[PDB]
Structure formats: C-alpha cells, structure tokens
C-alpha cells in the first residue's frame, strides 16, 4: 500500500556476541513485535530427552537432567534442515528429526573430577557440537573453559546417560532462548513525553541521549510520533547474532503468510458470505 514506508536499517556495531543496530521510519508495534520474536519465535536445538544409565553422583537425577537440558548448542548449520518432532513420520526419534548425545564419566582418580561440556559427545557428526572448545582459536578461552560444570565427582562416583536434542522455540521453554538479552530503546531525549519526569535534572543521559550534549534536558514536540528504535541483540552463543535476526524476520514472515492462507481458506472453504 502507498502508506507503507518500508523502514530503514543501520548497523552500528557487530561482534562475535553482540549485534547493535538502529531501525528507523517504522512503527513501535513493529519494533515491539519483532523484539518479541527474537525471544520466543526463533527456533534452536537443546537437549530434550535424557535417559540415565547409571548415576552415582551426589546430585539427584532430575537435577542432572535440568542442568543438562539448559546447556547451549550450536545449531546454525543444521537448525534449518531439521524438522519438528511431532511433524516427523517416525515413531519416537530418528536421525532426521533429532541428534544424539552420550556422556560417560567415572571418578577413578583420587582428585575430584569435573564433568563438563567437552566430555559430552555427539553421536551425530561434529557439525553440531556443544558451544565451547571445538574449532576455537578463541581469545574467550580462559582456565578450565568447561562452559558448564555439569557436576563434580569424588573417587568412586560414575555417570552414564543418553540425550536427544530437538528443535523448538522459546515460547515453549526457556532452554530454547536464542538470546543472552535484548536491549530496546526509543526516543532517548524524551521529546514525545511517553514518560513524565518529576524533576528531570535527577535523571542521567544514555549514550543515545547525546544529541542534546547540553543540559537543557528534553525539548518538547507534540506533532511528533515514535521513530528510530535502538536495538542491541546479544547472542547466547548457540546461534550467531545476525542469524538470530534473519531467522526471526523469516519466521515472522512464515507465521504471517500462513495466517493469510487460513484467511484465504475461509474464502475458499465455507465461502466468505457470513459477513
């Protein structure tokens, strides 16, 4: 339609972790809905079935199962071709809808052993390993760098289990969050008066509020509308930041186009003559 503006983007900054950008000339409802997709709708792989062969550790089993689900997983190369479990024709699991992990550790040593993310092995090809320590010429590598201490073991304890990771999205459980956090900010100088400051001098100025380097603090304009939203998406590490954004928009496109097909389905099946 003629009244659609088609927005604008600017990437301010990009790292292996963060992606920080500005969206301009669009609606808040778009900005807010797109921020919500970054959390909930972007799909990923995380452990979903844990089968415990032997567990002599001082942590109870369901605790091991909890810590273990929550650990992060690379998915970028494979999260797309993977299908959803319920949709897949197979009974239980298969190579085509899930990937398998195996963990086997025993404390035969006199010193306390730690159980870590590297000790967890993918029966699936090393296309989808755990996040830490793989093709890592990584300056983030410090001391142990176990990514997670699944448990500690004293001389005699042992741990054997199987796990099946599956594709799903954050609306269903928090283990599937593809974000470390999501900053969102709009109209930093409070031109539009969406908040009303009592004694405005008592508030600090963000890094976006510099435009009024002065201390005049918030010049008013009532003919304005919300424009130019600032973002900073931050990667949990399990999916690189730009891929989070591109997959979010596509998923949102997929969800919208589908609602259009059902709305079409109303005009095709049960001919739209009710109203």
Partner 1 sequence: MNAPPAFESFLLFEGEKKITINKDTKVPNACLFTINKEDHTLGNIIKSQLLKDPQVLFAGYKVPHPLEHKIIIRVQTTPDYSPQEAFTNAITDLISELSLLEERFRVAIKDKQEGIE
Partner 2 sequence: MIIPVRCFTCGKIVGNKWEAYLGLLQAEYTEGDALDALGLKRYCCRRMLLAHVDLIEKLLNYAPLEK
174 binds partner 2 (CB under 8 A): yes
Residue among 225, 250, 268, 271 that touches partner 1 (CB under 8 A): 250
- Tell me what percent of the chain is helix, strand and coil, each rounded to the nearest 5: 20, 25, 55
As a whole number of angstroms, the distance between CA 150 and CA 16 comes to 25
As a whole number of angstroms, the distance between CA 143 and CA 153 comes to 19
97 is in an annotated binding site: yes
242 binds partner 1 (CB under 8 A): yes
Angle at 202 between CA 199 and CA 206, to 5 degrees: 120
Q: Report the sign of the C-alpha dihedral through residues 163, 168, 169, 170, in that order.
A: negative
271 binds partner 1 (CB under 8 A): no
249 binds partner 1 (CB under 8 A): yes
Q: How far is the CB of 89 from partner 2 (least distance, A)?
A: 33
268 binds partner 1 (CB under 8 A): no
How many residues does the structure list for the chain? Answer: 275
147 binds partner 2 (CB under 8 A): yes
Q: Specify the residue, 67 or 228, whose C-beta has the smaller distance to partner 2.
A: 67
Angle at 116 between CA 120 and CA 127, to 5 degrees: 35
# binding residues, partner 1 (CB under 8 A)? 50
Residue among 31, 148, 233, 239 that touches partner 2 (CB under 8 A): 148
| Site map (CB under 8 A) of partner 1, residues 10-29, x = contact | xx--xxx----x-x--xxxx
- Judge contact between 48 and 165, C-beta under 8 A: yes
- Judge contact between 21 and 15, C-beta under 8 A: no
40 binds partner 1 (CB under 8 A): yes
90 is in an annotated binding site: yes
Q: Specify the residue, 3 or 142, whose C-beta has the smaller distance to partner 2.
A: 142
User: Residues 86 to 145: which contact partner 1 by CB under 8 A?
Assistant: 86
User: Residues 214 to 233: which contact Zn ion by CB under 5 A?
Assistant: none
107 is in an annotated binding site: no
User: Helix crossing, 241-268 with 28-40: angle to 10°?
Assistant: 110
**3-state SS, residue 95:** coil
What DSSP line would sit under 214-232, residue for residue? SSS-----TT-----EEEE
Q: Specify the residue, 99 or 115, whose C-beta has the smaller distance to Zn ion.
A: 99
| Site map (CB under 8 A) of partner 2, residues 182-221, x = contact | ----------------------------------------
As a whole number of angstroms, the distance between CA 132 and CA 237 comes to 9
30 binds Zn ion (CB under 5 A): no
183 binds Zn ion (CB under 5 A): no
Q: In which element (H, E) is residue 101 found?
A: strand 98-106
Q: How far is the CB of 177 from Zn ion (least distance, A)?
A: 11
Q: How far is the CB of 144 from partner 2 (least distance, A)?
A: 5
| H-only helix segments in the chain | 28-40, 61-70, 241-268
Task: Report the interface residues with partner 2, using CB under 8 A.
Answer: 56-59, 63, 67, 70-72, 107, 112, 132, 142-149, 151-157, 174, 177, 179-181, 234, 236-237
């Amino acid at each position: 339609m003629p009244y659609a503006n088609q927005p604008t983007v600017r990437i301010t900054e990009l790292t292996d972790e963060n992606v920080k950008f500005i969206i301009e000339n669009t609606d808040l409802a778009v900005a807010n809905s797109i921020r919500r997709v970054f959390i909930a709708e972007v799909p990923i792989i995380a452990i979903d079935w844990v089968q415990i062969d032997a567990n002599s550790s001082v942590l109870h089993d369901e605790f091991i199962a909890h810590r273990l689900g929550l650990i992060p997983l690379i998915s970028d190369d494979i999260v797309d071709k993977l299908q959803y479990s319920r949709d897949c024709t197979c009974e239980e699991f298969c190579p085509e809808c899930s990937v398998e992990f195996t963990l086997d550790v025993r404390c035969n040593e006199d010193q306390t052993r730690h159980v870590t993310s590297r000790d967890l092995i993918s029966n699936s090809p090393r296309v989808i390993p755990v996040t830490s320590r793989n093709r890592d010429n990584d300056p983030n590598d410090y001391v142990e760098q176990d990514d997670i201490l699944i448990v500690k073991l004293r001389k005699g304890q042992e741990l054997r289990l199987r796990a099946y990771a599956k594709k799903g999205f954050g609306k269903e459980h928090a283990k599937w969050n593809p974000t470390a956090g999501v900053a969102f900010e709009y109209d930093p100088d409070n031109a539009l008066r969406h908040t009303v400051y009592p004694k405005p001098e008592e508030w600090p100025k963000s890094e976006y509020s510099e435009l009024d380097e002065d201390e005049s603090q918030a010049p008013y304009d009532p003919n304005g509308k919300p424009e130019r939203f600032y973002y900073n998406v931050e990667s949990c590490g399990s999916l690189r930041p730009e891929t989070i954004v591109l997959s979010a928009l596509s998923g949102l496109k997929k969800k919208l186009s589908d609602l259009q097909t059902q709305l079409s389905h109303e005009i095709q099946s049960d001919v739209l003559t009710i109203n």
